[PDB]
TrEMBL record, chains A, B:
Keyword tags: Cell membrane, Disulfide bond, Glycoprotein, Immunity, Membrane, Receptor, Signal, Transmembrane, Transmembrane helix
GO cellular component: a single term: plasma membrane
Domain Ig-like: 1-92
Top-level taxon: Eukaryota
Protein name as annotated: Novel immune-type receptor 10
Major site of localization recorded for this protein: membrane
Disulfide bonds: 20-92
Record GO biological process: immune system process; response to bacterium
Cellular location(s): Cell membrane
Length: 110, 110
């Protein structure tokens, strides 16, 4: 089967966390979040990084409201003070050889 | 910027082609199409293959209406006799190191 997206109906100003698990990850370096604004191609904007914070944003991405909770269990994506510009779908994917496998995703709607 | 999806309003029974270019592809083996049914996580269902047809479907995928036009210029996805079950978004992506880059995508709507 195909996994369902988590659907979060959020209110402007709400703080959101979108979940992705480390449980079955083979190589953390190949783990990233992809943002798809409505009607756009998805694009990676943050990836795992071997550091204390545990992540690095994509070149050209800047938004102080975004962070991640990264540890041995979690690769979770946080937004403080969400707004309608954040509406869209978010996918957590791990590259494996020739393809990427998306283990989870969330639709943020208002 | 982010690339726009091609939006195709299709009618049941129409034959559709969704476009992806070979032009800038570094390694064709890492090229695949991803299907995202509404509310679901995207999933690869067909990839480039070094053969005369030029593609191989994912394990578990079977749909006789699907094919690809694959050559030195094109990695195009075809559906003969489209129906509302095909509604969703389709992304063409090439794996590069730790992330995938989606070069094109199409939303199929009815």
């Amino acid at each position: 089967d195909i996994k369902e997206l988590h659907v979060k109906t959020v209110k402007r100003g709400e703080n959101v966390t979108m979940e992705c698990s480390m449980s079955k990850v083979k190589d953390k370096d190949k783990l990233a979040w992809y943002r798809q604004s409505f009607g756009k191609v998805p694009q990676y904007f943050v990836r795992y990084y071997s550091s204390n914070s545990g992540y690095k944003f994509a070149e050209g991405f800047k938004d102080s409201r975004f962070s991640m909770t990264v540890n041995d269990q979690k690769f979770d994506l946080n937004i403080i003070g969400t707004r309608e510009d954040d509406g869209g779908e978010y996918f957590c994917g791990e590259v494996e050889g020739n393809t990427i496998k998306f283990t989870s995703g969330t639709r943020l709607q208002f």
